[PDB]
């Protein structure tokens, strides 16, 4: 069974217009997200600076991917009638997403565990197992979706989606176990937010496999547009939504540390115009 | 009734020259606005850092859009006589504006509410209703103006302008209610400036729908030029004018907090060579 | 009377080489000027931070314009014999200058008034009158030089130069009145430097109208080269020379404020390896 | 004996896809690595700031090389059937690696010796011998692999690989001697990590010569793909793995200095959510 | 007597490969040098901040020039057989160097005088004479080498080299006199380093005129390659070697000032893992 790849469909001008929009909306939102990360980096204590580093990495790699894609889009389709017709650079409108996810899904795992209560070498061994399962999941997906079969083979897609799903269940179990172990050792206020943030990240991961099933089941400029919109939208919701959630946890944990004397922070911490902690001096 | 889209008009060299000017004037002004935002970010306390983050995002997304547009303009028209003739990349001189507004109008709502006296989860639920109504207004506009009909249909434009207008009235009501609730809980000096800043943002929003009515009613290189100039000018006035207004409120609220002992600020605050507050140490 | 526009002259290879040099020399010098602005931004107190912001804006807009121009130059002329022959993008070697001046001449006015002793219904009202007269002068010049007539009409150039000159006399009067009112309220040392800096900015503004009279009076690759060199040279002298002068005034005014207890500064201020003020703590 | 150069092989679309992936994965990972370096630069004391400077240089030069390569890849192969066929810009997909290594292998030597206990002019003379042996090793490799013979000659490759190997043994001896001399003068905790970091850097250097032996022994799109993947993977593991290891040593040495009174640090140092040292004031 | 210009010669693939390498090696090294400058800018006191500003300017202008050149190189030669054949953009592989030197040689003069013991107006008048003699030397060189005969005339080259040499002797005398006057007023340790740094800068200036004599005396792809390699190598040695030397002097002078109470520095100064001065508070 051969399917057409998502980049092998001619777009109606509406579709072509919608895909440029969402691609550029995403790059823009993630460049705002990068600026926000840099501007708010001093709200978090050095105990939790990994949260900022992961988030910065998520936003830079994603911005780059979406920039490349938007430029690839300009160069990858040619108007030949009422339709936009894909050329050889149209695969570059879809494939960079797997590059972005290959860095970013690992980095999201790291960000979540940044604000969890795992310490030392135990915190560095869960962190490796998660970065491995997460990269493997994306890379086995890229294999089905792009490499083996050319994205045109149903058996490839199903075998490499099924392998990717096993790495998903593994990463997810590793992460959920680590949050379940942390929540008792956190404060009630932090524990509630971390539980929510885990549900949000784990749920957002579900959306992505849906764009893979479309590629398996349906082809057309409709389905190419659907794919782009689903994935753009998910990237925005996850890489802007989840990354404020973890910043608020890191702020709150920093503040709790300031109140306990565990550390000092140079600025007051505000979360929603409520002061959490005062400025102090070394 | 079919209209020609704004990007489907040949430009006289005067028009072509005027459009490059205004497009480049806007990108330049917004890149200055970005530098100003970064340079003055320490004048505001951490309670009000969202104002800076929103403003930074407004300036980065807008600078990008205007850069893309200026380069699209170079590539989207070809001199064939005394006229510049639109090619397939001429829609890229008009469409990126809807991408910019899709981030920026939401971010302006956030910036205004940043310096208002709404706190906690109530401040995070007005903030979502406003970001929703604001994005929806732009996206329903992009649909009429670019996507459905190809920007060539009067019925599309009227239906999607009318939907966009409802989202406008909603966002505006949400925001005005929130400012009306805040002003009593602010100092007389801050309340006066926030009232002014609300009138300025709400009024500047009115200008934009006028460029949509032109596209409905009039076509030619005259009207394409008018559109570009109106929108460029509005972007400059709003994204440079309004964004100094909110920075002055945030400064003044920071200073009032410094005088009340609510927080400390590392530098003195000056507003117009009058000192508002002194430097202090944690 | 029709003249050839400056971008409508074929260049001898010497001229082509000289114009690339000066264009690239200017972009380079202004990128150094931008780095210097950022590196020295903490030498000035927050009372005088507008000086830094204006200067930063002058250097960013100018660097961009000169970059665009240098790339436009590479793509705007084609070697066809011993001569370089202008194409349709050769106007892009001359027109971006009016975009740069449109931001930068307003910003220079702001920078000069930054270190002057005005406030309230002038600090912000003289600043608007000056930004208006300054932008108007450039925009009326762009009209004669580029837009109306295509830069090929003597009557256009003379009418729009004459209008531009009235906006020049107005801006200049506004600025000179404001400096004359300030000098008595400054210290003898600051007053002397501000007088010098006013003479330098006002004098450098004179040079620019000379490139406009050349375009009126003379055409050839000689005169195109003369124009580029005069304007490049003026940009370097004014945007690097004047912008150190205002930084030294802001430093000295900061230091005087530190000695008077009007404010504190975190670092010592040195002007020419002579210490003006010591470091202090909030 | 003539071999085909690695850039002289037509790629199957799978191979073409795999090479874009790994090239873009590497550029992305190194741009994250650059952001991490900048964000964490204040965790290390000024005694050890060379570690940060070297690392920053490693990440910037590498990011540039991989960017250039990814763009060269887009422009250096053309789809002519089921195969991607190399042009004259395909050598630009392989040759920039030798530019990156020419800066980065010297910089890695400097980074390792940054956290070792060599001081003064003895520390500046081992540092030069290492930078020399390291640059020479890459440059003699570039000669065999690219310059002399065109990368198509076995005798060239073997003579210049053999010379490169001698510079490898020399650099390695210099570095290992310097670490062996340092470990007794370090704390047990730092000494253990530096021993590990030396083994990791020295071992990662071994991988690179394997891509050279492939070019000698095997040609095809298989072997071109193998080369890219091996080298991309090694770059990621070494330039992200090793550069966290040296940062942790610098942190720990900074902390030990803080506890001994040798210096003060403005922030607390955390290594794996365990506090090493407290914040202090001059 | 007509010579071929350096950009006229067809390159063998070895030469073409060697020139790309060295051009890219230089851009890379200077971009590392820029990052190092920014990272180490706080090691120097505000009395000596000009050293950092000059150095930053040297690294930015040079990085830009070398980037432009590397891209011009990709576009300025076309493979037509076993040879790479120059087009009209090949002069852009050689001419940007004169732009870089025009900023950078003036800036090097400023950097050397930054750490010398000249103060006030006397320091500002030697600084102008040096910036003039230095710019004039490069500009008179660009005239012989590029502009007057197209770089194809021996009489031009000899007359403009001879003029350039007089500006060299003048600048050098000005600078050496100023160092000779400073050394008695410096500490023995600083005086020794400044003497060395003067010899290093003055000696590195000698190398550059050798690439000019080659252009006069010899033409071929051999001699074009020689030119590029000599100049790249000199740029690396001078703009990375000399710029660490002046930073070490500025550090040491800062430290001496800290020990004398002349100023305070927020961080300890280390030079080669030996502490020069402690951190202090305003
Ligand atoms: C910000 C980016 C995120 C969180 C992307 C996540 C992507 C996934 C969780 C993808 C999962 C996949 C499967 C488990 C099925 C096969 C294909 C994949 C790679 C889309
Ligand atoms: C800085 C950008 C701003 C504030 C842009 C604002 C744009 C609008 C308020 C647009 C409104 C529209 C309507 C209500 C009618 C339909 C078309 C729109 C999208 C232009
Ligand atoms: C850094 C840029 C500067 C200070 C440029 C200044 C430009 C002017 C003062 C131009 C003046 C003009 C006239 C008064 C005559 C008509 C033409 C103009 C625009 C060149
Ligand atoms: C981050 C980059 C690294 C550490 C690259 C290292 C590269 C080498 C150690 C290469 C060694 C080579 C030989 C000794 C054999 C000849 C060819 C070389 C240059 C690949
Ligand atoms: C970092 C760049 C440096 C220090 C370049 C220096 C260049 C010179 C000292 C060039 C001198 C020349 C002469 C005196 C002879 C004529 C040609 C020149 C411009 C190469
Ligand atoms: C801190 C973590 C940041 C994200 C790192 C992402 C992981 C990168 C992994 C590199 C590649 C792994 C090796 C894959 C080799 C595949 C060979 C078979 C291809 C058919
Ligand atoms: C929500 C995902 C589906 C999007 C549908 C896109 C249809 C576009 C038709 C022009
Ligand atoms: C087309 C859909 C793209 C956006 C999906 C985002 C899903 C996030 C789910 C969040 C669940 C919250 C639970 C608490
Ligand atoms: C801090 C808040 C930042 C706000 C950024 C601006 C808003 C982000 C863009 C939201 C994207 C939503 C996408 C909706 C999908 C619609 C699909 C319809 C298909 C016809
Ligand atoms: C505000 C309205 C803008 C009017 C533009 C007129 C353009 C005339 C072109 C010669
Ligand atoms: C107090 C009232 C402030 C009113 C502000 C109105 C802003 C209008 C912007 C106009 C932009 C140019 C359109 C041609
Ligand atoms: C403090 C910030 C200073 C920024 C300086 C730049 C100001 C730009 C002002 C733009 C105003 C545009 C006016 C539009 C008029 C359109 C008329 C067209 C007639 C053909
Ligand atoms: C003062 C500027 C004069 C420039 C003269 C330009 C001559 C060029 C001749 C090739
Ligand atoms: C007393 C101050 C006098 C300063 C005069 C400034 C003149 C600047 C001219 C620079 C441009 C030259 C172009 C030829
Ligand atoms: C601070 C560490 C910097 C690391 C990068 C080191 C770069 C050194 C470059 C030196 C270049 C030497 C070239 C000599 C001439 C080569 C002759 C080639 C003949 C075929
Ligand atoms: C360890 C590297 C091995 C890479 C194998 C590449 C195979 C590509 C086939 C398609
Ligand atoms: C202590 C052992 C460290 C070994 C590092 C080796 C790096 C391998 C890179 C991937 C090559 C396939
Ligand atoms: C702080 C120093 C930075 C470097 C200064 C570089 C710029 C120096 C001035 C450039 C302009 C000189 C004017 C020369 C005009 C020549 C006209 C005749 C051409 C044939
Ligand atoms: C320092 C001289 C450099 C020599 C470069 C040319 C060598 C031959 C190229 C083949
Ligand atoms: C103290 C002596 C310093 C000598 C500096 C020489 C600089 C050489 C520049 C590189 C040579 C290229 C061949």
Author numbering:
A (entry chain E), B (entry chain A), C (entry chain B), D (entry chain D), E (entry chain C): 3 to 284
List sentences quoted exactly from the publication behind this structure.
(A) Overall view of the CryoR1 pentamer in detergent micelles and nanodiscs. For the representation, the cryo-EM structure of CryoR1 at pH 8.0 was used. In contrast to all known MRs, there are no internal water molecules in the central region of CryoR1 and CryoR2. No densities in the maps and no space/internal cavities for waters were observed even at the cytoplasmic side of the retinal binding pocket, where normally at least one is found in other MRs near the highly conserved tryptophan residue of the helix F [W207/W208 in CryoR1/CryoR2 and W182 in BR (46, 47)]. In total, no water molecules were found in the radius of ~11 Å from the RSB, which is a unique feature of the studied CryoRs. At the extracellular side of CryoRs, we found a large water-filled cavity, between R99/R100 (in CryoR1/CryoR2; analog of R82 in BR) and the small (single turn) N-terminal α helix, capping the internal space of the CryoR protomer from the extracellular bulk. Aside from R99/R100, there are no internal rechargeable residues at the extracellular side of CryoRs. The exception is H230 in CryoR1, which is only found in 2 of 40 members of the CryoRs clade.
